[PDB]
Amino acid sequence: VLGPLYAIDAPFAVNLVSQNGRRYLKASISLELSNEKLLNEVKVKDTAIKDTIIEILSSKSVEEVVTNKGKNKLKDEIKSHLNSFLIDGFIKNVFFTDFIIQ
């Protein structure tokens, strides 16, 4: 049973560290929620959720995000940082519905 699904409206577009210059990530995120009432909370805290994600994504180098293992660690770090200020429920999963490195 897939929990309620929440799509963050806007894509994230950030710098990543690379050997030579910077590289660029475009990521869209959806969250799987533990319950329906967590849906109001993620909408109300939209700004805090985006700023948390931007700060996590913008800390990464390319070589940290080119494997399933690096991406899964990123998803786990997003999930624990968000779950730390959500009180009406918790995020079950983070989904990268788009993940494009340039």
Side-chain angles (χ1 to χ4, degrees):
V1 55
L2 208 66
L5 286 179
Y6 181 69
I8 296 164
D9 31 66
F12 299 90
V14 303
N15 295 311
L16 309 167
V17 181
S18 193
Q19 175 170 353
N20 318 297
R22 306 157 180 197
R23 297 194 76 187
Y24 300 91
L25 178 63
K26 185 152 180 274
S28 307
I29 292 168
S30 290
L31 304 174
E32 184 184 12
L33 313 183
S34 61
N35 63 63
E36 286 285 10
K37 60 174 166 62
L38 184 54
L39 192 60
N40 170 254
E41 188 171 10
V42 292
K43 293 166 186 286
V44 173
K45 298 188 176 175
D46 187 56
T47 298
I49 292 176
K50 282 164 178 163
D51 293 336
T52 302
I53 291 167
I54 292 168
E55 171 169 358
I56 294 171
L57 292 177
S58 310
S59 67
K60 299 296 165 185
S61 69
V62 177
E63 60 189 11
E64 291 174 311
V65 295
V66 293
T67 64
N68 282 336
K69 188 170 189 279
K71 277 181 236 185
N72 287 349
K73 155 148 193 161
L74 180 48
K75 291 164 171 198
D76 292 332
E77 192 187 347
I78 291 166
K79 196 179 82 164
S80 55
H81 287 236
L82 296 185
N83 276 346
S84 77
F85 60 78
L86 297 165
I87 70 165
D88 290 347
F90 62 85
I91 306 309
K92 285 179 165 308
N93 285 298
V94 178
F95 300 128
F96 293 136
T97 67
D98 202 40
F99 202 89
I100 302 295
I101 306 161
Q102 271 173 305

